[PDB]
Amino acid sequence: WTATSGSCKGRCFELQEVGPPDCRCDNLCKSYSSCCHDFDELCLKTARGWECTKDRCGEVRNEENACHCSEDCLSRGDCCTNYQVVCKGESHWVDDDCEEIKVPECPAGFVRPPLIIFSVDGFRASYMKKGSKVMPNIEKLRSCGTHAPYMRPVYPTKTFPNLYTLATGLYPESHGIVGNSMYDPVFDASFHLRGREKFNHRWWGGQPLWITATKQGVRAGTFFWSVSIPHERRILTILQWLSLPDNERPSVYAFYSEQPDFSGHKYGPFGPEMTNPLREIDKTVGQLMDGLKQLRLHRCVNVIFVGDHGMEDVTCDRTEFLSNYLTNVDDITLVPGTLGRIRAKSINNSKYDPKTIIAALTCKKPDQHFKPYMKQHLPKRLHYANNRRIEDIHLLVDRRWHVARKPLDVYKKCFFQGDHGFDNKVNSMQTVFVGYGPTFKYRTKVPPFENIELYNVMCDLLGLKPAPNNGTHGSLNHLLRTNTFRPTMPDEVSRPNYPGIMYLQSEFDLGCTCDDKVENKLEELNKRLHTKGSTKERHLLYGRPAVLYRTSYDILYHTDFESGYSEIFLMPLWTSYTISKQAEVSSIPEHLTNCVRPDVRVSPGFSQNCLAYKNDKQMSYGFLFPPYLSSSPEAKYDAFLVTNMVPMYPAFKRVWAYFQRVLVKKYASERNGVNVISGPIFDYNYDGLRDTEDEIKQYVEGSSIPVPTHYYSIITSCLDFTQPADKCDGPLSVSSFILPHRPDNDESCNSSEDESKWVEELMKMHTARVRDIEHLTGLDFYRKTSRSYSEILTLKTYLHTYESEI
Ligand SMILES: *[C@@H]1O[C@H](CO)[C@@H](O[C@@H]2O[C@H](CO)[C@@H](O[C@@H]3O[C@H](CO[C@H]4O[C@H](CO)[C@@H](O)[C@H](O[C@H]5O[C@H](CO)[C@@H](O)[C@H](O)[C@@H]5O[C@H]5O[C@H](CO)[C@@H](O)[C@H](O)[C@@H]5O)[C@@H]4O)[C@@H](O)[C@H](O[C@H]4O[C@H](CO)[C@@H](O)[C@H](O)[C@@H]4O[C@H]4O[C@H](CO)[C@@H](O)[C@H](O)[C@@H]4O)[C@@H]3O)[C@H](O)[C@H]2NC(C)=O)[C@H](O)[C@H]1NC(C)=O
Ligand SMILES: [Ca+2]
Ligand SMILES: [Cl-]
Ligand SMILES: [K+]
Ligand code: NA
Ligand code: NA
Ligand SMILES: [Zn+2]
């Protein structure tokens, strides 16, 4: 119940939301069906439209008008945005030359530059170039301010997950808005786009910017607007709030536009009908900037123009139906569209089997336009698993396609020509970022970045301490003229041991054998040096990784590679090696095929053993430093040390062997040398974070050798590829991956073919940021470079996407 008999008199767009059953006058009252009876009359005035005209100049104030052209309007803060242009001979903001804003130029009483967020739904990154002719205001913001060629949204590339990621700095799995539609099994409640359940606070986790601001004494405008409030009224409301007394005035504001998403769904991303929505958004930007200029705030406010996701061409005919795959289609519930989520229709049905469902959906049709995954097997870059609202079974849908349960769902729900929600690496899903104001840089282009990073920057812009989030604070310092955040490197927690030769061969009873007993102070002195780290500067280019948790580990040096060997996990946490452009690939000699050698620096009790591999019929082994890339026949023996061995399913060995034998050399030739750091990852609870020992669900049979869920590699070279990786004087270039350690290659439909037809494709799908690997391993990389820490943070957030040019 709401007693709507109260009044909005002097309360229009009030900032504090009044509690029930008292009627509301705020910008969300319509959405709650709770506005006072006179809200439309008083707060949504439309008379005479939105623009001053010559004959309205100096008019007698008529309070009925939507906006004013009278002489008193500036002090009242309610002129039409074009007032000074029409009535006072001023120019529109867009017609002014841009001039660097070196310092905030603010009216007296302003304690900080306000921040205005202008968010646009469905604003695809390529609109900045493709629509440039019809968006002069936005184009001026872009060229005069700081801009990225694009900004990467989060997965799924849906509206609510992205807007709330923007607001919180969190992945959807952490903030809890994991789709536009959700079922929470603990609440036993459903979240929908239409309805009232979505208003319950329990869905919305983390701490959004408006709450962070309020808790730290920075006043915030209300970010959300009821659909029926016209854009012109939203702008006028913001401008009116900016005229409040200092003690009452917010420092942070948001405008939201439902366009171009609304039209993009109907007409496709580049439908000829899309020009008008783009023109109209630009006009709104013009109104804001003209309004700011009138208030003498155009060189004081920081403005962020930001989108949530792009838009792809998608039509009804491009729909895959689960009824063409499953016999039992009525025993499931599907969340459909540009992603699929499957669960049992009834929790009381004991015939339901996720294993048989996945199999029935796996590589069944030649051109199949979706791929099934257990959520924990999704690419780690998506960070889409650690939430009870995310169903165990997920369908990654090809761009341009839908998945639905049955054909009747599609014609009894073509209408639409556009949609979004696909993998967040997809070019059509990319969106926009422009920052303009005293705190942003002048005429500066910055590399693409992820929207999870913005919360930290918005906190910086407002002098706020950010709540704990998934951004890497400092990684976007290069966007800013001032207010940069200067982080310190995390402290190493565990110092390594440096073991020398401490064990005789015969102390080892590992069931390993090697044909290495085929035997000089000239070379014996030399190998002693190598074991003491004489080549470490070549193979460890950026310092040793820091171990940021409590553990027991050894640094092991070799001619060709260096490792940090965990006595706890019985394998390296990391293995580092450099391969020059000139390096040659060799084979594993016949006599060494099954060679495994005890490491006399490491105790039998802290070593793996070959017998466990013999006994475990499912599990084989591989090596982290590849024997194929040994610098010499004698150095090759180092590669067969038991301390370089890791457990690998035979199916995974196909992937790993191809990476190591073919791809590393290929990258070294293309990139002028590469430094490689590889290692295991253990993430059995799929939280994106390093497992402790007691979280490991699988061991090599009969042993304490834990099985990795994933294997990573970080591949670094010089950004200026005229310089070799090991002699680089400037910025670095990186690509990384986190490959799932799976007992089959079911993910790769073409895996029965030669590795050259499918392995690199798989690796590209599992591309990763160094930062993702840091979370998953508790390691901190690039500790010793000649580069600024902020630059290194940006490098650590880089994702190599393998898409063509935007
Ligand atoms: C991205 O950034 C985020 C933010 O930094 C990272 O997420 C953090 O990770 C931490 C470690 O996983 C986690 O810390 C835990 O906090 C527990 C208290 O959590 C509540 O309070 C916080 C603070 O206000 C709040 O943010 C939380 O909000 C979550 O839950 C609510 C409702 O459930 C949701 O609305 C909200 O969306 C959010 O959900 C997300 O996180 C939860 C986990 O909290 C997931 O379950 C969801 O799926 C979703 O992703 C909470 O309201 C605290 O109790 C924990 O301490 C326990 O666990 C450790 C064991 O390791 C132990 O030391 C403690 O003693 C204690 O153990 C006891 O409980 C165990 C479990 O029941 C039990 O097994 C034991 O026997 C003990 O009884 C823990 O410290 C932190 O909450 C989240 N924060 C957020 C916002 O998600 C994230 O990791 C980053 N991602 C990457 C890839 O880097
Ligand atoms: Ca984990
Ligand atoms: Cl969804
Ligand atoms: K085996
Ligand atoms: Na052997
Ligand atoms: Na396969
Ligand atoms: Zn949409």
Side-chain angles (χ1 to χ4, degrees), residues 1-412 414-518 520-806:
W1 177 264
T2 299
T4 68
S5 60
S7 175
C8 284
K9 155 200 156 63
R11 294 174 57 203
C12 284
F13 297 102
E14 61 192 353
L15 289 163
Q16 300 162 357
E17 182 196 335
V18 283
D22 309 347
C23 63
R24 292 167 48 168
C25 302
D26 60 287
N27 60 357
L28 276 185
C29 70
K30 289 288 200 183
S31 299
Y32 288 75
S33 260
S34 61
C35 312
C36 306
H37 72 278
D38 53 9
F39 181 79
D40 288 304
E41 181 194 356
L42 296 178
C43 310
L44 299 178
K45 287 168 184 165
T46 48
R48 301 262 257 155
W50 312 109
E51 292 166 20
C52 285
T53 44
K54 290 157 178 171
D55 65 283
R56 282 192 69 186
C57 299
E59 71 187 357
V60 186
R61 167 167 288 268
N62 188 340
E63 306 276 14
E64 276 187 349
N65 294 325
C67 52
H68 306 282
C69 310
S70 47
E71 197 65 20
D72 72 340
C73 75
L74 281 155
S75 55
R76 292 283 306 267
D78 61 10
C79 311
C80 305
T81 63
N82 72 342
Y83 167 78
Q84 288 207 137
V85 173
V86 181
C87 303
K88 293 282 186 287
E90 266 284 17
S91 52
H92 283 285
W93 174 82
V94 66
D95 292 311
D96 298 331
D97 301 333
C98 63
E99 305 285 312
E100 191 173 358
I101 312 163
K102 293 195 191 157
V103 296
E105 296 166 24
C106 295
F110 279 77
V111 70
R112 64 184 69 80
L115 172 62
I116 297 171
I117 302 151
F118 195 110
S119 59
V120 280
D121 191 24
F123 203 106
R124 183 176 166 162
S126 56
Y127 288 160
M128 292 299 247
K129 185 146 291 150
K130 296 172 83 56
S132 65
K133 247 76 161 175
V134 310
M135 307 190 298
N137 284 280
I138 290 159
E139 293 306 325
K140 184 183 169 185
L141 288 177
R142 189 205 69 88
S143 61
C144 303
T146 299
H147 82 282
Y150 57 91
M151 182 183 69
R152 187 174 312 120
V154 288
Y155 184 79
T157 55
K158 296 288 198 182
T159 296
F160 284 151
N162 277 277
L163 293 172
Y164 205 56
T165 284
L166 287 161
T168 58
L170 297 165
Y171 300 121
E173 68 177 7
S174 294
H175 66 54
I177 309 303
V178 312
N180 279 337
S181 174
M182 299 178 279
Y183 173 73
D184 186 305
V186 172
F187 299 160
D188 177 45
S190 281
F191 178 109
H192 304 294
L193 284 151
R194 290 287 176 205
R196 304 192 68 87
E197 181 58 41
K198 71 165 195 298
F199 296 126
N200 197 311
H201 276 224
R202 66 190 178 164
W203 294 97
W204 308 84
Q207 188 187 94
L209 185 67
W210 58 89
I211 298 299
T212 308
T214 297
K215 286 185 175 282
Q216 297 174 47
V218 169
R219 280 175 316 284
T222 50
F223 282 27
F224 299 80
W225 305 85
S226 292
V227 287
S228 59
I229 301 162
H231 290 190
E232 298 90 345
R233 175 56 56 198
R234 302 181 195 192
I235 296 306
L236 289 169
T237 299
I238 294 165
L239 293 167
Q240 186 68 70
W241 284 333
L242 281 164
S243 291
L244 284 169
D246 303 337
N247 81 270
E248 285 174 65
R249 186 178 60 245
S251 276
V252 61
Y253 302 86
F255 169 89
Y256 175 78
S257 165
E258 304 79 4
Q259 287 283 33
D261 180 87
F262 183 70
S263 290
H265 279 291
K266 297 156 87 290
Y267 306 115
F270 308 110
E273 302 86 350
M274 295 305 293
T275 292
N276 287 343
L278 295 177
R279 290 198 181 273
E280 286 308 290
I281 299 156
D282 196 74
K283 181 168 172 162
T284 303
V285 174
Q287 297 180 346
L288 177 58
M289 297 316 289
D290 286 346
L292 293 179
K293 189 181 167 183
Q294 291 200 152
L295 300 179
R296 307 174 175 270
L297 285 166
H298 65 304
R299 297 173 55 85
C300 170
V301 174
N302 292 299
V303 174
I304 290 170
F305 183 88
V306 63
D308 52 3
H309 51 70
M311 185 69 69
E312 178 62 272
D313 291 287
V314 179
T315 54
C316 297
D317 64 318
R318 297 196 293 269
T319 308
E320 292 266 6
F321 302 100
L322 295 193
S323 57
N324 296 330
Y325 297 82
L326 306 183
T327 67
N328 59 299
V329 97
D330 294 294
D331 287 342
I332 66 154
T333 293
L334 172 71
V335 179
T338 50
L339 49 154
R341 310 205 304 276
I342 294 165
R343 62 181 192 281
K345 169 132 193 149
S346 164
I347 42 140
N348 295 133
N349 172 40
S350 45
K351 242 86 262 176
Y352 176 83
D353 200 342
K355 190 185 171 175
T356 72
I357 284 155
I358 293 280
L361 296 174
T362 296
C363 311
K364 284 304 154 66
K365 304 270 153 64
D367 274 346
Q368 196 172 310
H369 304 277
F370 66 89
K371 191 182 290 305
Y373 284 87
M374 285 298 289
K375 62 181 187 169
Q376 69 278 9
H377 295 152
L378 286 167
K380 301 294 276 177
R381 62 184 173 79
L382 306 170
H383 298 279
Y384 197 73
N386 189 211
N387 197 289
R388 69 202 185 202
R389 296 165 192 173
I390 298 170
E391 283 81 359
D392 292 351
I393 301 162
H394 197 81
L395 309 185
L396 273 189
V397 178
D398 286 359
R399 66 192 80 187
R400 298 169 51 88
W401 285 74
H402 278 165
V403 65
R405 202 172 56 105
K406 298 192 279 194
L408 71 81
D409 293 348
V410 168
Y411 59 85
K412 297 272 272 189
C414 179
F415 315 95
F416 58 87
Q417 296 186 260
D419 209 352
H420 48 90
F422 304 107
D423 186 338
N424 66 329
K425 82 171 191 329
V426 169
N427 272 357
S428 60
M429 297 299 92
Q430 307 309 299
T431 188
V432 296
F433 174 86
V434 177
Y436 178 93
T439 316
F440 288 107
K441 292 185 168 181
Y442 174 66
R443 298 189 175 277
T444 295
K445 182 181 77 209
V446 300
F449 64 90
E450 307 188 331
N451 69 348
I452 60 166
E453 300 299 332
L454 270 178
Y455 171 76
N456 280 334
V457 171
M458 293 186 293
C459 288
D460 288 337
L461 289 169
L462 296 163
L464 302 171
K465 177 175 188 174
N469 69 90
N470 304 127
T472 292
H473 200 174
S475 76
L476 294 191
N477 278 352
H478 65 285
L479 275 65
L480 305 168
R481 169 185 308 267
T482 76
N483 295 25
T484 51
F485 173 82
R486 293 297 174 187
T488 202
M489 287 190 176
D491 291 346
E492 186 158 26
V493 175
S494 294
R495 73 162 161 271
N497 303 299
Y498 295 92
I501 304 175
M502 297 157 69
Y503 301 94
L504 303 174
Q505 183 90 4
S506 67
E507 302 189 64
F508 294 87
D509 191 10
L510 312 173
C512 302
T513 61
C514 184
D515 185 45
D516 64 341
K517 270 145 191 166
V518 186
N520 186 29
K521 287 170 183 170
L522 297 160
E523 296 190 349
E524 280 157 55
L525 174 59
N526 223 183
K527 59 207 297 294
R528 273 173 267 175
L529 297 192
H530 292 335
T531 303
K532 292 291 173 184
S534 73
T535 64
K536 73 178 168 191
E537 337 296 340
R538 193 188 136 74
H539 298 303
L540 197 72
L541 290 180
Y542 324 105
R544 65 170 175 76
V547 173
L548 306 185
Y549 62 97
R550 182 65 263 164
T551 198
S552 169
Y553 84 106
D554 303 309
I555 299 309
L556 303 179
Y557 297 116
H558 320 78
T559 306
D560 292 346
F561 67 103
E562 182 181 334
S563 70
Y565 178 86
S566 172
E567 294 193 333
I568 305 312
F569 285 71
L570 309 177
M571 71 188 69
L573 299 175
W574 59 263
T575 296
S576 187
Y577 62 100
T578 301
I579 303 301
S580 74
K581 190 186 202 321
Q582 291 69 50
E584 191 166 274
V585 177
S586 57
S587 60
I588 295 173
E590 278 180 60
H591 73 289
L592 298 178
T593 306
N594 303 304
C595 162
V596 176
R597 303 172 59 241
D599 194 331
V600 293
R601 302 166 293 192
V602 173
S603 82
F606 293 135
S607 298
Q608 290 175 45
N609 75 95
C610 291
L611 187 59
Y613 292 101
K614 192 188 186 297
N615 293 345
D616 191 320
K617 292 304 191 291
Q618 315 303 316
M619 188 61 66
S620 183
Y621 67 85
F623 294 106
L624 288 175
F625 173 80
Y628 312 110
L629 292 173
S630 63
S631 56
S632 76
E634 191 197 324
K636 202 188 286 288
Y637 290 90
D638 297 347
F640 298 110
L641 285 168
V642 69
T643 45
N644 185 39
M645 187 174 62
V646 289
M648 293 197 168
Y649 289 119
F652 189 77
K653 279 172 68 186
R654 297 184 63 200
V655 175
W656 193 249
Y658 187 77
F659 161 64
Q660 287 190 321
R661 187 180 55 88
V662 181
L663 299 180
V664 177
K665 182 54 224 146
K666 192 180 91 178
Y667 304 145
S669 39
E670 291 175 354
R671 298 174 54 179
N672 191 7
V674 290
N675 176 257
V676 181
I677 305 168
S678 300
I681 277 162
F682 304 90
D683 193 17
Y684 280 97
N685 61 356
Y686 48 88
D687 64 356
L689 310 175
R690 175 197 55 96
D691 289 351
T692 51
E693 172 197 302
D694 63 1
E695 289 172 328
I696 303 306
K697 295 174 70 53
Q698 186 175 344
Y699 290 88
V700 181
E701 188 180 341
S703 76
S704 290
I705 311 164
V707 176
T709 54
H710 296 83
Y711 283 101
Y712 73 85
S713 289
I714 297 167
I715 307 177
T716 312
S717 63
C718 203
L719 185 62
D720 173 15
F721 49 78
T722 67
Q723 305 198 304
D726 61 356
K727 290 189 206 58
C728 180
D729 295 321
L732 304 170
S733 177
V734 68
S735 70
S736 305
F737 62 72
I738 298 170
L739 280 167
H741 181 215
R742 290 185 48 185
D744 60 66
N745 282 300
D746 289 359
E747 182 178 1
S748 303
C749 293
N750 293 346
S751 65
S752 67
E753 292 165 32
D754 185 68
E755 287 83 8
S756 65
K757 314 290 179 185
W758 64 273
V759 165
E760 203 170 9
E761 184 187 324
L762 175 68
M763 290 172 48
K764 287 175 183 189
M765 191 57 49
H766 294 278
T767 190
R769 316 174 302 147
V770 172
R771 199 72 188 100
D772 297 321
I773 292 162
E774 293 187 333
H775 293 317
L776 285 160
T777 63
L779 300 175
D780 192 62
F781 300 99
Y782 305 120
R783 315 268 301 173
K784 313 286 182 155
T785 68
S786 58
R787 314 308 300 170
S788 91
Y789 188 40
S790 280
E791 178 186 307
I792 289 306
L793 293 177
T794 306
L795 186 66
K796 286 181 176 188
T797 62
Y798 176 79
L799 180 77
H800 199 97
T801 60
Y802 306 97
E803 291 280 297
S804 57
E805 281 198 45
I806 290 275

